[PDB]
Amino acid sequence: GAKNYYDITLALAGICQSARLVQQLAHQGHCDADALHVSLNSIIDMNPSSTLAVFGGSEANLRVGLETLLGVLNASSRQGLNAELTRYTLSLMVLERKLSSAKGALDTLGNRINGLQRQLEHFDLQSETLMSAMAAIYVDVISPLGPRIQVTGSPAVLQSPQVQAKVRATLLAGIRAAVLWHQVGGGRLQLMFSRNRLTTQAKQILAHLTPEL
């Protein structure tokens, strides 16, 4: 119901999940399939009873994002791997605010997203066809509204048009999570003032996911 750190943490975990999947992709050319399936499905599922239902109704679906979030909030080096994750997450947040403020853009985007039903009729969500249709939406709708997210990794890997397509489609997911984040009370100032509460809540969810330990 009312603004709470549990929902804010999940939505933040979605933005970090996008960021981390882009990073696996750019360095290795492959990413966690289960996490990507979750992130891609959050773009298209128009049934959102709760924040968590956006990601399929299970906390396990965001594990990647929750673990990433812990470094993005706290480790915060200016170099190395974690500094890439931080730069991607802040770029996503800056782009979503441009999208939210740009007269008309959010209506356009919703229509373009619903329009993936044209392709989903004949092609699965993870196909090269869907990946390129979702990348086209990111590129046509979102990327002109602000600074480009500069993606770094192995340059040879990144010349693949299929890697490029998946990158862009996953960036669309991170935008979709940032939209949710603001819808559940999240924002810039909240994030500067509530860090330890987000970190603690994410640690709690990961402990809840791992009763083995």
What are the residues binding Hg ion (CB under 5 A)? Answer: 12, 15-16, 21, 25, 27, 31, 33, 36, 69, 72, 89, 121-122, 172, 175-176, 182, 187
Q: CB of 136: closest distance to Hg ion in angstroms? A: 13
Nearer to Hg ion, 87 or 182 (CB): 182
**Rounded distance, CA 18 to CA 39, Å?**
7
Residue 104 in tokens: 């008309």
**Rounded distance, CA 53 to CA 35, Å?**
15
Nearer to Hg ion, 64 or 175 (CB): 175
Of 184, 167, 160, give the one whose Cα is nearest residue 8. 184
Amino acid identity for residue 201 in this structure: Q
Nearer to Hg ion, 121 or 212 (CB): 121
Nearer to Hg ion, 147 or 210 (CB): 210
**Rounded distance, CA 166 to CA 134, Å?**
8
Q: CB of 49: closest distance to Hg ion in angstroms? A: 19
Q: CB of 7: closest distance to Hg ion in angstroms? A: 13
Cβ–Cβ contacts within 10 Å for residue 45, how many?
Answer: 12
